[PDB]
């Protein structure tokens, strides 16, 4: 039942958002020839969405740097 919409509105209020460039879309589309890998990536995106919605962050910060350094979300 998670109301993702509220999280999205909170984030947009806290930070800026932009659409994916076609290049990134094609790259991820090519790389993600597997449902499992998609789910893994989406789980990382969901955790990031939660943290950003609460705290926030630099819209230009790379997502991998944010997850690995700040969230320590390795492993």
């Amino acid at each position: 039942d998670w109301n993702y919409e509220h999280l999205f509105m909170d984030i947009k209020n806290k930070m800026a958002q932009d659409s994916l460039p076609s290049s990134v879309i094609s790259a991820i589309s090519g790389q993600l020839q597997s449902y499992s890998d998609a789910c893994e990536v989406l789980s990382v995106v969901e955790v990031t969405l939660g943290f950003l919605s609460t705290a926030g962050g630099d819209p230009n910060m790379q997502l991998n740097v944010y997850t690995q350094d700040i969230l320590q979300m390795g492993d």
């Binding site: 109301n3 919409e5 509220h6 509105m9």
Partner: protein, 186 residues
Amino acid sequence: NELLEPLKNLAFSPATMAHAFLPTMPEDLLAQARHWYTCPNGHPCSCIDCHAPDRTQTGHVLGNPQRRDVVTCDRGLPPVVFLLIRLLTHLALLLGASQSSQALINIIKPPVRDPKGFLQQHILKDLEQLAKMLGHSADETIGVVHLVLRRLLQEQHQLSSRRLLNFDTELSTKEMRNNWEKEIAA
């Protein structure tokens, strides 16, 4: 006098007053003052609980007479005058109950089985309140009620003309009732 007609309808022809507004009622002050806002789905908000940014009644809505400890008037009338108006209303309602009980059972909310007794108890509580307010003996209080009724009997030949009576004999609305209250008080 046309001013009496509403009360007379209560006494002799209560069936008409079924959907009529009676001075024996409070109003929704919230609708009249036009803090808590409200969401589109209906929950208050001073968004919260969703994350998205008339109560006035007809008929006799006063409940058990035992609760009637004090009299309050929001329409700017003095408590004493509102009390007397309400008492006249209860007398008319008792007359109507004598004419047809079912009509009063329909008009009374929540419903009741003994309109006559219910109205008697309300009248007694009215007298107790009058006594507390003015500070006169019980007999002097009943005398005050008779004096007011006498004034109303006299103030017709002098008040049958040159009047500004913005009310209908059935008090079909809220403003008609308020206006009748003000004229009576005057």
